[PDB]
Structures are given as structure tokens and as C-alpha cells.
Design an enzyme around this catalytic site. Structure first.
Site, PDB file in Angstrom:
ATOM      1  N   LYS A   1      -0.795 -14.706 -11.985  1.00 26.25           N
ATOM      2  CA  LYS A   1      -2.080 -14.005 -11.966  1.00 26.25           C
ATOM      3  C   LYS A   1      -3.244 -14.905 -12.364  1.00 26.25           C
ATOM      4  O   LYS A   1      -4.310 -14.831 -11.753  1.00 26.25           O
ATOM      5  CB  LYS A   1      -2.051 -12.758 -12.871  1.00 26.25           C
ATOM      6  CG  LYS A   1      -1.065 -11.690 -12.430  1.00 26.25           C
ATOM      7  CD  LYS A   1      -1.430 -11.110 -11.082  1.00 26.25           C
ATOM      8  CE  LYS A   1      -0.556  -9.905 -10.719  1.00 26.25           C
ATOM      9  NZ  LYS A   1      -0.960  -9.418  -9.370  1.00 26.25           N
TER      10      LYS A   1
ATOM     11  N   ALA B   1       0.800  -1.227   0.000  1.00 23.65           N
ATOM     12  CA  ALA B   1       0.000   0.000   0.000  1.00 23.65           C
ATOM     13  C   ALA B   1       0.833   1.277   0.000  1.00 23.65           C
ATOM     14  O   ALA B   1       0.290   2.338   0.261  1.00 23.65           O
ATOM     15  CB  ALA B   1      -0.983   0.008   1.180  1.00 23.65           C
TER      16      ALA B   1
ATOM     17  N   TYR C   1       4.572 -13.937 -14.763  1.00 33.79           N
ATOM     18  CA  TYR C   1       3.606 -13.026 -14.148  1.00 33.79           C
ATOM     19  C   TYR C   1       2.171 -13.482 -14.538  1.00 33.79           C
ATOM     20  O   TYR C   1       1.266 -13.582 -13.698  1.00 33.79           O
ATOM     21  CB  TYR C   1       3.914 -11.599 -14.649  1.00 33.79           C
ATOM     22  CG  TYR C   1       3.066 -10.483 -14.102  1.00 33.79           C
ATOM     23  CD1 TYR C   1       3.258 -10.009 -12.796  1.00 33.79           C
ATOM     24  CD2 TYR C   1       2.065  -9.883 -14.873  1.00 33.79           C
ATOM     25  CE1 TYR C   1       2.482  -8.976 -12.288  1.00 33.79           C
ATOM     26  CE2 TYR C   1       1.293  -8.837 -14.363  1.00 33.79           C
ATOM     27  CZ  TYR C   1       1.532  -8.387 -13.082  1.00 33.79           C
ATOM     28  OH  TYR C   1       0.748  -7.374 -12.573  1.00 33.79           O
TER      29      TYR C   1
ATOM     30  N   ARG D   1       2.218   2.944  -2.529  1.00 39.75           N
ATOM     31  CA  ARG D   1       2.040   3.839  -3.649  1.00 39.75           C
ATOM     32  C   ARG D   1       1.064   3.269  -4.646  1.00 39.75           C
ATOM     33  O   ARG D   1       0.599   2.156  -4.499  1.00 39.75           O
ATOM     34  CB  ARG D   1       3.386   4.119  -4.319  1.00 39.75           C
ATOM     35  CG  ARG D   1       4.014   2.904  -4.962  1.00 39.75           C
ATOM     36  CD  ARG D   1       5.493   3.140  -5.298  1.00 39.75           C
ATOM     37  NE  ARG D   1       6.219   1.890  -5.076  1.00 39.75           N
ATOM     38  CZ  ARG D   1       6.884   1.567  -3.962  1.00 39.75           C
ATOM     39  NH1 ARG D   1       7.021   2.423  -2.946  1.00 39.75           N
ATOM     40  NH2 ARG D   1       7.469   0.375  -3.883  1.00 39.75           N
TER      41      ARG D   1
END
Lengths: 247, 247, 247, 247
Positions: D158, D16, D154, D18
Site C-alpha cells: 500500500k 467490484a 500489506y 462486494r
């Protein structure tokens, strides 16, 4: 005939001792492929050699071990030529509801069902990309798309294989390699035969077709995607589930 | 061989004068089906009779007219026996951005591309359900799944065919009929040949495979789903698009 | 607050007499929209005027008749300004297994559930595109994605709306209009209340959440997509089904 | 108002500091949640404490370390009560074409982007299941659904999170916990700001909306799913991508 003819292709089918993997290896051989099936043990490898006869051979392969992968691929390339068709069929289950699922049950599934696919795919791709011709076919599961209580780990790995498959498809499409997944529903195997009458009835209740699939039905879908005729199919998930799920 | 063998099956392929429909009809005949291909005109029907020779015949069919459907099916049933494989390939485009799209361009697409599939499917299903054996295969489009600017009508109708397919699959699965869609991407046909160089380059740019599909590639997918070996595939959409879209 | 604030927006909600449509209209008004809800009769229109009070009004609308659409939109534009949010909620069922499904049951569903969405969407889009700001939200159904035996027509039309939605989304995205579908599962309404105990139990058995949805739950999803905060959501189908289907 | 009101809820938002994670934590706090945001460092934790003020606090969390998870959850439970909303936003990239992708780049992504979700989800679920009320929301990526060249790892992680999410949804739906994924497209962050003009133009070319998403747009989708009003949404993937992909 020249239809769905795999003569001249070298196929590596992981987990080919029985059931789905065995049906895949036999059908690819029947369509003229030279087939290398793998098992985790030498005895398994021999059982595969026995059923493939002159159309190929069995090899021991540890899909979670880099050194074994390299040794098996070297032996294949030396005798048969580079792999033209990879079928990633090896996979395990470690079922448990999440609150009961151990770290090791999670990590064993990731290793065997997902990371293995990364390793083996990477290991055969270079040769396929040089020839500008190749097939990678992952045997997934309806569970990867549908989810299933008690199988969050297995579902994660199978869905992960689809994301991997799409990305790899995009990487290698222009070089004539296709990457796809065949996603079986509830197929008649040793696992389904070990169920209660009540669990079998419950499984059948989820299937509009009203029966379990035969391993040959998974083999046929794989052989189709493996063929020259399926060159324009890539990044696809072919569901073979009797209507259990419809995307 | 006994692999993907359609001997003993009667196949109705709508829109079979050229391109995809023609490739489908020829391949089904090659695999041993008795094939009735249709066109909108008698001369088209004759062209189909010419290319099918002893393996089938051409008939004139208006897929938007109930009386024509009944007449064609009666003639087929009388000579060949009831239809075992229906391939719904007939379909048109009437492209326009929505603000330019006429009522008639919307309704003609609904009629020809979606309502036709309802009518023909319903007309062949009773016989299939009595035999407890059948295949309905709709030739869709990647546009049904992806959408496309300027083709909201065509996209609606093709997506509609998928909703129909899934419902029908659920209705008839337990009686041994499968219902599926093959969804072509950009395939080389008269339409794509009529494009200028810039439009062809733009199409190719959307395809990871870096080429247009061949009509034979669509035919192979249709033949696969039509086969005994695909009995456990139902309510599925098989994408043949070179990676243009990945579901 | 400024969060999910529809003050300054004019919303047209079709089929707003009761259930889902009513919940949508009320919530949009709660979030500050000026709301025009429609019914097929003047008395229905009055019921809507009654529940909306100063936040909007009811109008009689025949979603299958061009003249009615033009009259309603003219009256809205004259009093409130052009429509900023269109919610296409009007829709009927005409259930039957395919062998029992009449031509008129097919065509009525196409007309009311799919062609209506083409007509209304087209009728509001020009104004939205000039303002470079708009929301079109279609109330679909899980049946569009899952299929359902006995509802091949309803499923076709709802799936068709998704193909339309994706194409329109692509046409109008760069001009600040979003087009999306909310797909309810089994929601508590008059229809579900008319079921016997055994049918309610059968429905609940398909829902992991173990209950029917509330119409307010569909309304919340619609309000979300209608908001400024959802500007980057387009061509999407938001499923609100308690886990009945998972895409 | 009582609409999308998170007063009384304790939210844990990983990653959290940015961008997206920060926008999520701020909006949940704005809707009345007590928010614990995490960073990998103490300084990061302080930056989070600084922006949350009286509405919550920052904590250091190593999402790949069991002991850290237990320590952070104990501190939260002691001060705020058990976690009601988990947002799994922490994640990294290790991009490379497959032939260049190292074992460690694969395994770091699996650990941080997929196994972390298993661990943290499992760690908060028991309390949620006892209360019969909970939200788990995974911040995914359009890449998990679309695939992307150079990001096979990635994409795998996901997509894996989606399979996990569906399975967990099925496990816990009847106990009032929902599990969903929000899948951002190309969002304006430090990463996108580090691109070339040519790469930014190429990204925008893939987006019908013609712009990058704002982190607030991802926050809004998360806050929606977090709300009482989204109780009937589970096992869903909410795409927020400007039309970059349409499912």
C-alpha cells in the site's frame, strides 16, 4: 567517549563497495562497530576487507538469493556474534517513463530494493528480538516520498520500504529493536558524476542548500540512528536532502 | 574526536533549568560548545551557571519581551561571540478542551511557544547569515503532528513552528544555516511524574516502545542536528517518540 | 438529488467577497445550503447579499474582534438557526524575508490567519456539539506544508491551523463534528493577476499540471468535505495544488 | 446537475463484487459513468452485471495476468470507448508477524496489491494521455501510512502504491491525467464482521469517530476524485479513517 559509541556492536552494511554504503561502513567502524560490508562479487568483498582492515571484513552477498543470505549470516554469527545493526543500502535503478517501462525493470526493482529488505530484515530480527536490542536502518531516497517522473518503480520500492519499516517498528518496538529509514536527497556519487553539466545544474536548482550531499552526510545520519542514544526513535524516516523536500 | 564536535560554537538554549532543556545544554557543553542556558528567573539562571561551570553560563530571559532578548544577545555577543546554535526549548502548556479554553490560554501559548521562536530566530539569524554558518533547532512535540484533545493551543503553536521552520530553511539554506525541529513524544519529566498511575499507564499504552523517553534522548537528537555532520539536514522534523506516531 | 446535498444546513463563509471565498459561498448555496458570507466592510457585505439573493446574505465581520463575532453569530442564529458549516477562508499575507519582517507583520498574520480560527471555531462548536452534527473547514495553503521563503509568517499560521484542526478533530469526532483543512496551491485570483509575466512563468514552473487552479476547484473540495458523505473524514488536509507538493 | 457529473466517462473498477468496490461501482454509475466492474470469476462478473444493469457490466479479470488485462481492456474499448477512470480496488491480505511470514505470503501481496497497479495503470494510461484527460484512483489503506503489526507485507504494498502514484502523477500531470489514492480506515465489511466482539471493540478504540466507516463513504471520496471538479488534485492521498490517523 561513551557518546555514539558502537563498541560491542556487529554491523552488516549491504552494498558497501563505494559511495554511500562505503561511507556508512567506514563511519560505523570509526565509532567502534565490528563491520561486515557486502558486495555482489568476491572482488568487491576483498575491496571492502581492504578498507575495513582490523575493524571488519567484506563478504559476497546476493540479496535476492535466500541461500546466500543464510550462508553470510551464519559466517557472521560464527565469527562476530549475531548482527546488532543491519543497514540495508543495496539497491539499483531501472529508470523509464511508465509507457517504456518493461515488466522486468519493474520486477527487478521490486526484488532488489524491496523484497531484499523483507528477506534480510526477517533473517536478522530473531536474534535481535532475543537480545531485546537491535537496529534496522534502511537507506531509502527522497524519491520514495516525493515521487519522480521516470522512476515510478524505484519510488514504489522505496515508499514500500517505509510502510514495511513502520509495520516492523510496531511489531518489535517493545522488544528494544528500532526500525528506521534514512532518505538521502541528491548525493555526490558516480551516478551524479555521469550526468551532463545541464542535468547537474537542474539537480542543484531543486536544492535550497545549493549543493549535492556528501556520502559522509548520509553515513552520519545512519550512525546516529544506529547508536544507543537513538533508542527512542523508531518507525521514522530521517530526510537528508538539503531542503529538496520538507515533510 | 572530530566527530560531532561543537568546539568553537556558541549555543543559546532557552528554558534550560531542568528536564529536556538541561539535558540539551549539558550535552552541547560535553561536545565542546560554549553554552548559554536561560531561565525566567535569576535564581534559575544561577542554577544553570552552577551546572555549566567553565563551559558556559546561565542568563535570565523573558522570551516574550523584545528588550530582554536584545539585552541577553548583547551580553552573549560581547563575551562569547555571536550565537552559532539556537535551541528554542522554552515553552509552556495551558491545557483545556476548546469550550473551556480562555482567550488568554490561547494567546499565552501563541506568545511563548510560537511568536518567541520568530523573535529569537530573527534576532540570531543576521549574524549566522553573515558567517554563512548556523543552526536553529526548535524543540517541538509529537502533539504538533498528531494533535491532542485538550491541547489545541499547544498543538497549533508546535505545528506553527514547523511551518516557520520550513520557510526559514528555504530562506537561509543557500547561506549555510539549517533550521530544523526535534519533536519529542512522551518524555519522563516533572509533568509526567505528577500524573497518577492510571494516566501513566494510559500514556505508556500509546507507546510501542513501552516506556517514556529520557530527556537525554531528546538532547542527543538536538546535538546531532547541531553538528557539522548534519549540514545537509534542513527543514526537517526529527521525531523521537518511541513509535507513538510514525510519519 | 440526495448526493452532496446541503439543504437544511446553515453555512458561514468568512472572506467571501471574491475569489476563493466567493466561489465557496456560491457553490454551497448551489448545493442547497443557506449561506452567510462575510466581508470586512458593509459594502462588501452588500455585494455578497447581491450575489447570494434568496440563498443567503452578506454580513460585515471583523474576524480579529470578539464583539463582532458575537454580534454576527447572534444575528445568524436568530434568523437562520445555528451554524452547521463553518468555512474559515478569511486570511491575509504580509510577506517579507525574516530580516525585514516587522513585529506587526508577524502578529497581524497570527491574528487574522490563526487566532481567528480559534475564536470562530470555538464560537460555533457548542451548538454543533449539542446537535451532534457539524463541519469546520479551514482554507489553508500549500505554503503551510511546503514552507516558502518570504512567507515564514503566513506558513506558520497555516501550519498552525493544521495542528489546531487535528486536535479539535480528536476532541469532537465522537460527537459527529468533523474538522478539516483544504490546502490550495497557486490559484488564479487578483493577487496572481497582479504578477508580472516572469513571476507567473515561475509559478507555473512549480506546477506539474502546468496551470493555476481555479477558485471553483477549491470550492468543490470544500463542498465535498461539507457534505454528509464526508462524515468519516476528519483531521485531514486535502491538498488541491496541481501536484506542486505531494504528501 | 452538472456538479460531479460523470456522464460520458468510462470507469473500470477492479474487485467490484462486494463491499468497497461494489459501493464505488454503484456510485460512479449513479453519477452517470458507464461502469465496468471486475471480479476474479465469471460468476462474480455476472453478479456485477446484475447490479449495474444498463449502467454497465461485469467482467472476469485476473489482475496478475497480462493476457487477461489485454483481453478485458480490448472488450471495454470496443464497446464503450477507452477507459477514462481506473479505480484499482482489487487487493488481498496475507497476515502474519514477520517471523511467521512465508516468502509466498510476501510475494502474493506484492503481486496482487502493487505489481497489479503498475500493470493496469500502464495499460490504461496511453489512451488517457492521448485524450489529455484521465483519472487513476488507487484504493489504499490507512495501514500504508500508519503501518500495522502483522501486516508488514500489506503495508509495504500500500505504501508502494503511494510512491508509484506520486511518480506517475508527475509524469502525466501536464497531460491532464490525475493519479491519486483514497486510503480507507477501518470500514464495515465481511472481514470486520468476521472479528470477535473484543477485536471489534479494540478497532473502535482506535477511531475517534467511534464507529467503522461505511463502504459508501469510501465510494464518495472516489467519486469526488473521479470528477471534473477534482482536476487540480493529483499525487494526493485522501484519508477516510474517522480520525484513526491524521497527516
Amino acid at each position: 567517549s561513551q557518546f555514539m559509541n558502537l563498541e560491542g556492536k556487529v554491523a552488516l552494511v549491504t552494498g558497501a563497495s563505494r559511495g554511500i554504503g562505503k561511507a556508512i561502513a567506514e563511519l560505523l567502524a570509526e565509532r567502534g562497530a565490528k563491520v561486515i560490508g557486502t558486495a555482489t562479487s568476491e572482488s568487491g568483498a576483498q575491496a571492502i576487507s581492504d578498507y575495513l582492515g582490523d575493524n571488519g571484513k567484506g563478504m559476497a552477498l546476493n540479496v535476492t538469493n535466500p541461500e546466500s543470505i543464510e550462508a553470510v549470516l551464519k559466517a557472521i554469527t560464527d565469527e562476530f556474534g549475531g548482527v546488532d545493526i543491519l543497514v540495508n543500502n543495496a539497491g539499483i535503478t531501472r529508470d523509464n517513463l511508465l509507457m517504456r517501462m518493461k515488466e522486468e525493470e519493474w520486477s527487478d526493482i521490486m526484488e532488489t530494493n524491496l523484497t531484499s529488505i523483507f528477506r534480510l530484515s526477517k533473517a536478522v530480527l530473531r536474534g535481535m528480538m532475543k537480545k531485546r536490542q537491535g537496529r534496522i536502518i534502511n537507506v531509502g531516497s527522497v524519491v520514495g516520498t516525493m515521487g519522480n517522473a521516470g522512476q515510478a518503480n524505484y519510488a514504489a520500492a522505496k515508499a514500500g520500504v517505509i510502510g514495511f519499516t513502520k509495520s516492523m517498528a510496531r511489531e518489535v518496538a517493545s522488544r528494544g529493536v528500532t526500525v528506521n529509514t534514512v532518505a538521502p536527497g541528491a548525493i555526490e556519487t558516480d551516478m551524479t558524476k555521469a550526468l551532463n553539466d545541464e542535468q547537474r545544474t537542474a539537480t542543484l536548482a531543486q536544492v535550497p542548500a545549493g549543493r549535492l550531499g556528501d556520502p559522509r552526510e548520509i553515513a552520519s545520519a545512519v550512525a546516529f540512528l544506529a547508536s544507543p542514544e537513538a533508542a527512542y526513535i523508531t518507525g521514522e524516516t530521517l530526510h537528508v536532502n538539503g531542503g529538496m523536500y520538507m515533510i
